[PDB]
């Protein structure tokens, strides 16, 4: 229900870009459990938490 | 063209394409190109510009 002709040049190229996108996005799925670190280390994650990664710093 | 293998023949031939550039020096580039191409050509059955 999507195929009329396949030029195999830009469309295989589309598979290539799509698979690169998929590997890039699924290589980052490492989280999913909110964690309880201690205040002793606190300086080490307020600053040494990775650049380019958002940190939702919840306090309660 | 006889062989496409000897160095002096390469100089004499390709210099003709070379006059379109660098009117003030010819033989130097001829030496460079002839040495490089004679080194690189397998001389048997095939070639790629790459």
């Amino acid at each position: 229900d999507e195929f009329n002709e396949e030029d195999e040049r830009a469309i295989e190229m589309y598979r290539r870009r799509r698979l690169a996108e998929w590997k890039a996005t699924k290589l980052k799925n490492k989280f999913g459990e909110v964690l309880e670190i201690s205040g002793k280390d606190y300086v080490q994650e307020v600053t040494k938490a990775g650049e380019g990664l958002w940190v939702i710093l919840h306090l309660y | 063209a006889k062989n496409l293998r000897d160095i002096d023949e390469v100089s004499s031939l390709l210099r003709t394409s070379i006059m379109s550039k660098q009117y003030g020096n010819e033989v130097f580039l001829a030496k460079l190109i002839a040495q490089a191409c004679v080194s690189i050509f397998p001389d048997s059955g095939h070639f790629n510009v790459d």
């Binding site: 964690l35 309880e36 670190i37 201690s38 205040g39 002793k40 280390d41 | -």
Partner: protein
Amino acid sequence: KIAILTCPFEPPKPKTKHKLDVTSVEDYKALQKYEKEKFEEMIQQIKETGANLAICQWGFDDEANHLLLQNNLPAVRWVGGPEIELIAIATGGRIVPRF
């Protein structure tokens, strides 16, 4: 007479992602015993070594606060780093990293 600590008064957690599997009410009582004995052994260690004053860099919990109180051993907590460093310098003692 003072001892200088850089650690809180609480069952520490390791730096690695740790998962303690609990499947029995016996493990529940084991956890309860573990926390209570940890607090009491911390108190025994500190009060036993022969000091009167305690100082905590990163604070600690009110349970250990009352344990220090009714043990009649004065203590302080939540002090800046170089402040503690100069305190140890002046008193001539040593900052013990852990119990």
